[PDB]
């Protein structure tokens, strides 16, 4: 699959232009940067980055294999 496909679900917590209030006050995804987003999204998928509220997101992003991980960051980096 590829990032774009996953994001469609992600809208639930991040909104379109990755800025809605997630599980409380959270940094907006809104073009942090592909580097940042990749490392953080990778962090979550791998389980290196996370926390209580992140648990849902962790499993959500966990579905992303590799193409997906990279592309999700790339996509989010222009959103
Ligand atoms: C709520 C139910 C969420 C779902 C589903 C998804 N994310 Fe999320 N995300 C959430 C929180 C609480 C935060 C914390 C950010 C902070 O530090 O305050 C985030 C943030 C991100 C980021 C930005 C990185 C950062 O700022 O630390 C990334 C890269 C991210 N989220 C990725 C991601 C993906 C790929 C999701 C859907 C495919 C997704 N999130 C859903 C809460 C929730």
Question: Can you tell me about this structure?
Answer:
The protein is an all-alpha fold. It has one domain: Cytochrome c-like domain (Cytochrome Bc1 Complex, Chain D, domain 2). 56% of the residues lie in helices and 0% in strands. The chain is built from four helices and no strands. Helix 2 packs across helix 3. The chain is globular and about 30 Å long. The structure holds heme C. The site of heme C has 23 residues, from helix 1, helix 2 and helix 3. Its main location: periplasm.
Secondary-structure topology with pairs:
Layout: H1 3-14, H2 34-46, H3 54-62, H4 67-76
This protein binds heme C.
Tally of individual domains: 1
- List the quaternary state of the chains: monomer
Shape: globular
CATH 2nd-level architecture: Orthogonal Bundle
Q: For the record, what CATH class applies?
A: Mainly Alpha
Radius of gyration: 11 Å
Proportion in β-strands? under 5%
**What order do the helices and strands follow?**
HHHH
Helix content: 55-70%
The unique ligands bound to this protein are: heme C
Strand tally:
0
Q: How far from one another are the termini?
A: 19 Å
What fold name stands as the CATH topology? Cytochrome Bc1 Complex, Chain D, domain 2
Query: Tell me about the biggest sheet?
Result: none
CATH homologous superfamily label: Cytochrome c-like domain
Number of helices: 4
Structural class: mainly alpha
Function: Natural electron acceptor for a formate dehydrogenase.
Binding site for heme c: 10, 13-14, 57
Keywords: Electron transport, Heme, Iron, Metal-binding, Periplasm, Signal, Transport
Subcellular location: Periplasm
